[model samples]
Target: PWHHIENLDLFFSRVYNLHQKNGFTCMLIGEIFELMQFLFVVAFTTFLVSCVDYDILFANKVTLPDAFLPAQVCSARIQENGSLITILVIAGVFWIHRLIKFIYNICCYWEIHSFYLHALRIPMSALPYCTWQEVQARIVQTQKEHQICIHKRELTELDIYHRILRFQNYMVALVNKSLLPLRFRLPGLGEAVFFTRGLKYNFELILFWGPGSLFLNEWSLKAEYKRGGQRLELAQRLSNRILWIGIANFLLCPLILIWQILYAFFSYAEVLKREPGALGARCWSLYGRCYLRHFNELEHELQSRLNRGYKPASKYMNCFLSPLLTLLAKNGAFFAGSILAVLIALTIYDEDVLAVEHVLTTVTLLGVTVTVCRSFIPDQHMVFCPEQLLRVILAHIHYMPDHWQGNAHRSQTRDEFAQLFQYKAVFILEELLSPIVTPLILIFCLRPRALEIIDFFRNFTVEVVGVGDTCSFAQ
Candidate 1:
């Protein structure tokens, strides 16, 4: 039964296969709802852009009788726009494809659900309350009776972890060995790491799933890649493949860039208006996650660790706040707040004042400015404990450079740490820029390291009876 399982990227397949049938159903429902939600966003945004009159909303001209346009007129407006029609058609096709995949996934999840209830003797209701260790213990106990993996007499914890984290181990190794083209030295920015979702997807596609990828099957590298004699030739072929993939990315850049823009706008536009300082909050960057992840660590494990470290990390960063910046933020907040207070009072006295052009804009800008300025102001009662806070963060994050020990108070250490726990705004900006930068890195940086990648696979891969080939580090 396990031998027939083909997907190499199933991070939690063991848990999903072992128990949590009802949880799986909830997940399926959530997936469907997400698809619908995306469609609603697109359709609603189109309606707002094409059908609505901003002039009427702002009371610019006040054509009262004709303000309420008919439904048919709005429909005609949408239908008349050629670009909207094209976008809808493209989105419709993509939606259909996702729906089909969701259907297929549901069938697979149902099979696993049956396997858990009937074959594993674990009920659906018990899954949520039970810990992973309890479930893992049951599986290990059941292995003796069922001989689930015929190739091995016993199943161990490491074997199960290895199966779950096969691909992740490879990624962790790549980041550890500095094999990926993530680190760059910009002319002005000095060193930076660019490992956005797009770049990661491209790496996986080229290395694992592409037609001419290094793997011959889900669990094995091509035999030629294993041989040392053809290393140069293999490197050349891999470089050519990277070149073509980069070109494909370049061609698709405009569409992807547009999608990124639309998605970011839809997702953040309201949040920015409601609470402008939300983007000023920091979160763990993608590169940070990969770099700090253990070889066989699970997603939830890493998430919990980072969640615990969040407060300390924030305090540590806040300790290095510039005095000059704080002075500026304090005065700026005062000025903006003073203006905003007057605007609010005037608006309350005569609501018609809002009808003036750019009055609303000024109010919004001032509000945003005040909120942003306030974010830079540290708590008055806060105490400094750079070394202790850094140590507490390290205790949860589990990774830190040796040089950071004594230099916790220095701006240099703070600058480097910011790369790991970056501003949410910075993350969004990097993702927006990824469509353009990814192709360049793939062609120039990644293509040149083809030989190193070839050697990495040959050196690090190890074979097991039931698991086939997996990263040796995972073992």
Candidate 2:
């Protein structure tokens, strides 16, 4: 459903907030005027150009390549073609722009807390009730003692932080090893990133930078990782809103809207797959219960106890990280450029190495598919799939319980169990708005393509490794 009608207020409000914190009316009016002016100019210029002869283009005779031209010359029913095309293009622009934003938001949703927690809920929801099950039965009898009793004090911030961080490390490894093809290929960073073959540059271009950007992360106990009830609420709210948007008006509205909803749900669900099922919803609910229940008093107490000008962690985390991510993204992008420089330089020295990168990408993507299918990730990739990582962002919404919204920790108690909803949401508004796209993903599953790419690598590797066609000791 096109949210232009339903969530118009909410959508525009955030957009308005994005441009300017204050003066929403002024900003909206000004934006409308600017948009109108821009459209008028487009119309006038097109009309004027149609009335005049554009013979100069022919005079130059700087012919473009055949490959660049459309498959067939544009049809010649000038009035029908032009008018219909114009309407389509204009509507397309509105729809496509929305879709790009939405999908990018979905894939890169490490920015939104609700999306983050929603992602974790999938896994958390899968587990059965563990209320009084025999601990010895669940855990290996030898190591059962390691399970902490729940009645103890609340989890310390450091403990949660460490656990989540450990998962981060694993996710980082996955991205480098399997998720990102054409990831950092520089000698020192080979293991830090990987490449898949037969895939286009778009996938590489996207994956290369998404995982490395800091804007995608808000590591504090606040919105970056909603601890309990807060996370579930965030997930549910976001999921419901997105579902509503998609369900309504579907074909009549922008196709991107549907795309956004599907991708967003898919990604959010993938994250939730990590948490134990029975504990998922209750945990996030507890966070909301903890914070909102005491929000005002806590804020008051916080002011009295803390130093002169310290603000709440959530506010600081929420306010600062968006811009912070942008700044970090600026620097993080240097990694891609650096890789490009090396790849280009190496191409000059060795064309096959370039081919190796392509082949590497294909292999890595295949590897990740296999690994993801068989392996488990509770806090993996911060609960992001490699594909989703390329586009979505974290919104720092209220996702986890207040306990973990501040920091990640394991506070498993007898009756009160909590694992820091130490996770982030991916705002996948872009994916839902866009069509499902993956680069030559078929090649990964296609054994023949994989074989060909491998054969190329094997022959190249052999030639490079061999000494004068003899597989013997070096002279």
Candidate 3:
């Protein structure tokens, strides 16, 4: 049952490489630090907004008649009373940072390529199987074809980029998307072979921005094989020597680790549902096999090739410590400012301090729920409802190999995908937030006193109207 998907050796390998490249020590660290800064801004903004908004809303408080406004509105009660803010802050940071980076990359592709890629390029010796030259040449050829298509009006520039990206998505899906073969008969093959030559051609996030993984190591191995077979040979030594440090970081702030893993796990399961089974994977694998395999062959052809001796650094230490150091370094101003801002908000609450305290109490409750969810649940329990999406995909598609080509052509734009991911990401916050916010509605907005007042009015109105109607009927 654990191995629901089959014949995935190649798929696993590419995923390993994807994780290694995209989940870099620096980037992942930076993301965590950025999120802390994000929380600082959010809480800071909310504190100020809440103070000002409530003040203005209550400014006209005496003018409003009781019948005109709902009890909550009349009371100027806004439910800021929940631990939901934390979730929003985290989700907002993830999204805003990603969007800014996406735009930055697109706008400054040339600068990024020259400044980052050239320096980061590792020698073929480190990545004997995968190299930049071959990857670059293939991309060049694809662009040349893209250029020709554009000139003839067969494809626009945007169209070509989307197509190229979609094909790359296909490659990733082949490795990551599982269980499609059982659901639908897409091709002669049930599972897609994800590797071409010895290299994983899957498009990792880091690849789009700069020179990609020039080598691979135990990080990829531990991901795929766990502690099995040859993986134990170096895994034990590496774990003891360095990875133990990574393990320690997880021990320090399990929230960050739990959140990221769950995010990745849920995301991959959703992707499996979205893609058109083995047909999608097979077709994309076909493209990868063609381009990357050709590059693999051509890589050794250059006579003046240099072999830079690459060393394996402790990604473990850097991964944990990097975020910690960066957060302090980058967010010190905001973090300090938020503390002061919050203190001012507490003072600003004046009479409404009671409402703020109710929210604070609810947040304290939510923190316990958060910790319990992390500490008690088995990790596998988090996979959560893949079948729902799987059924949706099956109901919509023909699921035949012959239809594969036709299916692939019906595609989503890059911007569309980003929007979907951002919207859905908000829910992780919303779900956690809604529960905490619900009880507060009655606590502050619709007080028992207010509800009783409304109830009495309703009965009085009914009796008066009934008496009037009876008098009319008699007449």
Candidate 4:
């Protein structure tokens, strides 16, 4: 028992030293490579499997490159039309997000109304008011100053009908409330609706909103606030199109993704068949020239895909990877021994290097994978999107000076991402500029004392974070 425990402890300690406590050692490189794999995975799975690529037309068999290439342009075997279908799917996500947000606004207001049925933000709720005097007083206080006169009379049938139309977004917001209905799907999230869910429990908000237009059709003929009736009715009728289109767009998206993946596999097959049959060293000069000339075109395609990515986690990483590396490695050593070695190592080595990097290099191109892999955390920002809290954090506009908090928090938490990135950038810049700036400071007094400068910047950052956290808590 003692012998086994000692060995186990030694093994774990060694593993930690290699991976956790490090600089630019093998562990670091391995980790970086692994990170690249993850980022690439995110990029592809999130977007490429769902983006459209424009075909550059070549001669003979509908190739997608410009300028006839003097009859020798290398044709990339990719489907242009199919990629376009993928683009539509990618764009649809945002469209759906917007529609969902619209509905949530209504739901929250409905909750507020229900929770504080007696209180109102703008105009007071009519249900709580027993007489025209009370309702009129509340309405006159909130409505257009000129319209203040209109609120004094008995409840108007027209007023009731028009207000109902505005309730459309509220209804939508409630139904799409993050907690209730955000089903997401992909290589990333499983029926991902839960990913965006937030506020859904505020039943009090409904007090402020009038009943929906569909429910109030019978009441409008007797109501009074008839102004703007035509516009509201027309808008609501047209808004129906958005719901139907949103559904269609949602249904078509998965088909596009499947098409994208299938298209890519077939394209790869075509490329493999074509890679051979090229002339020997005699063609080297032409090969070199073509490689340089066509580089930008390929790069543009990759960047465009990265920008447009709406892929799942698995697909994202795979999309940007250089597939040939994995294939060649597989044929060389993967089956021979490495697969078993990797499986065993999985128990010991870090997943970033042994698992992610090893897998990514096989499928993705090294450079692109490396660039995106540096992102480290893929889902890190997902929690912050338009939710308001994250936006505040990213902007570093956490709180005013009068707000609670001190300069100590920033230094205390080196792990906060934006601050860390800024710190690293400043450190690198300071190091690079030190030799030049140090002497200049003495000679010209253009630079402040180094300690003073450090204190100023670091202190400023700490104060910002501290204050921001304070406000966040208050909210």
The numbered model that scores best in lDDT is: 1
TM-score of each: 0.84, 0.21, 0.22, 0.18
Against the correct fold, how does model 1 do in TM-score? 0.84
* Per-model lDDT: 0.81, 0.31, 0.32, 0.31
* Residue ranges of candidate 2 with Cα displaced over 4 Å: 1-29, 33-248, 253-407, 410-425, 429-475
Top-TM-score structure, candidate number: 1
Q: Candidate order by TM-score, highest to lowest?
A: 1, 3, 2, 4
Model 3 residue 333 CA deviation in Å: 61
lDDT of 1 at 298: 76
Write candidate 2's Cα lDDT for 260-287 as tens digits. 4533555457666776442222212212
Worst 10 residues of 2 by lDDT: 466-475
Give me the displacement of residue 431 in model 4, in angstroms: 48
The RMSD of every model to the true structure, in order and in angstroms, is 5.3, 27.7, 31.6, 30.3
Worst 10 residues of 3 by lDDT: 309-318
Backbone clashes in each candidate structure, one number apiece? Answer: 0, 95, 0, 65
Q: Write the per-residue lDDT of candidate 4 for residues 255-327, one digit (tens) a residue.
A: 4344344434443456447763221111111111121221112222333432232122112112232336545
Which regions of candidate 4 are displaced past 4 Å?
1-165, 169-191, 194-213, 216-475
- Write candidate 3's Cα lDDT for 1-475 as tens digits: 1111322222223323322343233334555676566466545544443434444355533443322435455234324544445555565677787768755443433332322233334332343344544444433344443332223333222232222232233233333333111122228734222222112221222112222221132111113222234434333443232223323332433334334444444544676577634222211122222322211122222111211100101111111223344445445534444554564567576746534666556444544444443433333332222333323322332132333333322222212211212223333333333333323322332232332322221222111121110111111
